[PDB]
């Protein structure tokens, strides 16, 4: 009775995500990188594969019902920390290009001035 | 695509968060077949976690997360030479 909605509901979410997994691991961790050239295009693919797996191993560990969840939780803020870094790096790439194009527009106006 | 499939991951993350929130042992008492269905729904998890085991192919698990994050690090250091030298 009480378990009867949630267990079929969550399994349907597994059923929902189950084709998404197979399209995610369609081509290999080498292949899906080796088809790509930009390391920025290589970047989050490493993360996102780990990003799901982190939640995946946090999910299945609940099914054993083990009272500990720390040594995957200890891995959790790690994966955040590396996701924290290159975004702030990629923020700085903007300011490299954001202001250099204003340098482009300014010096043309100087001869115009 | 990140924003699509992770939104579906988030969808199942919350559903994974929705899983053992209820008291689960009570119908494991009331039948094995609740537990066995919960075992069978874990057999999805025995398959769906294995998909990325297949991508490679607990103490097993403690190994490769290094080797996952191994390859994260050599990006930014190359990105350091790709950008800070640039």
């Amino acid at each position: 009775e009480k378990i009867k909605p949630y267990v079929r509901s969550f399994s349907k979410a597994l059923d929902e995500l189950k084709p998404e997994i197979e399209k995610l691991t369609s081509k290999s961790l080498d292949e899906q990188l080796l088809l790509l050239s930009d390391e920025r295009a290589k970047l989050e693919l490493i993360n996102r594969y780990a990003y799901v797996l982190s939640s995946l191993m946090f999910a299945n560990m609940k099914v054993l019902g083990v009272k500990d969840m720390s040594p995957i939780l200890g891995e959790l803020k790690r994966v955040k920390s590396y996701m924290d870094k290159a975004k702030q790096y990629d923020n700085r790439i903007t300011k490299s290009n954001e202001k250099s194009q204003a340098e482009q527009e300014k010096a043309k106006n100087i001869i115009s001035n | 695509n990140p924003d699509v499939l992770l939104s579906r991951v988030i969808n199942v993350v919350r559903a994974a968060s929705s899983l053992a929130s209820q008291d689960v042992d009570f119908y494991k008492n009331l039948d094995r077949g609740f537990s066995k269905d919960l075992k069978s729904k874990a057999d999805k998890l025995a398959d769906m976690a294995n998909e990325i085991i297949l991508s490679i192919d607990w103490n097993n698990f403690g190994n490769i997360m290094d080797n996952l994050l191994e390859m994260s690090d050599h990006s930014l250091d190359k990105l350091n030479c790709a950008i800070n030298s640039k």
Partner: peptide, 14 residues
């Protein structure tokens, strides 16, 4: 709405 906060919420519990 940082994308690790879904690890942090307490679920809907009966």
């Amino acid at each position: 709405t940082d994308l690790f906060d879904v690890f942090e919420e307490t679920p809907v519990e009966l």
